[PDB]
């Protein structure tokens, strides 16, 4: 994984360069938003279970997928999918704190579509549940942190589609 600072340092180091004015620009940009990022991460850690509960209730709780024949019918499957949503929320929070989606590429999206296709998990319903989670999360953390979190939520949805 590499955060914004690591990415800037890598871009400068891969050219044998010292950190010039543009690197300082990006570094100041990250340092100004770090405190908002910490606030949002704390608030999201506070209310993870309620966020997942509300997203599931608004997205797929009463649809036909929770009915016999659906992919998430039995109790095993319901528990597995809520665990998946918890994974997505936690990794989106990591990406928001780091300011860089490389952790999502390395730890989440690598081989996820193939696993879901082998298992038979519907991708569209998953993307819609992540979109509903984006709504609740932006709601709870306010506009700026919600846009920051929605960046990585949309990153996960694009990597999954």
């Amino acid at each position: 994984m590499q955060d914004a600072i690591t990415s800037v340092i890598n871009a400068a180091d891969v050219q044998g360069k010292y950190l010039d004015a543009n690197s300082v620009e990006k570094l100041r940009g990250y340092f100004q938003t770090g405190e908002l990022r910490v606030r949002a991460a704390a608030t999201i850690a506070a209310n993870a279970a309620t966020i997942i509960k509300e997203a599931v209730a608004k997205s797929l709780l009463y649809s036909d997928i929770t009915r016999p024949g659906g992919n998430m019918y039995t109790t095993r499957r319901y528990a597995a999918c809520i665990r998946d949503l918890d994974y997505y929320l936690r990794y989106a929070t990591y990406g928001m704190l780091a300011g860089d989606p490389s952790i999502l590429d390395e730890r989440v999206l690598n081989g996820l579509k193939e696993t879901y296709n082998s298992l038979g998990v519907p991708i569209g319903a998953t993307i819609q549940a992540i979109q509903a989670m984006k709504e609740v999360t932006g709601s709870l953390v306010g506009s700026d942190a919600g846009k920051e979190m929605g960046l990585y939520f949309d990153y996960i949805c694009s990597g999954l589609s």
Binding site: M1, Q2, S7, N10, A11, V14, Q15, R76, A79, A80, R83, E106
Partner: protein, 98 residues
Amino acid sequence: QNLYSIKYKVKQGVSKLRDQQKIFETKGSLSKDAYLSIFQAACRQIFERDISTFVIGNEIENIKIQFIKGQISVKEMINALGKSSVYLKEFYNPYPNI
């Protein structure tokens, strides 16, 4: 240089995962949470994920209580974990011996 050339050079590597890894182990005089989070780290290594989505709850309880009390080492807990009914159901029944 540009984004395509830089991204190629930044990725050349074994992986940063090799540096970015932490080991668990029992040091002297751990409390009971410290024992619990070590047991939960074992469950993620031997079973590849948290157990609560593929067990009832009463399957490795006596193994957890035994390790939290300091009665068995880490190696005994891992050995007992690997020969539980949970490990048999997940990584033996659905696959060939190879």
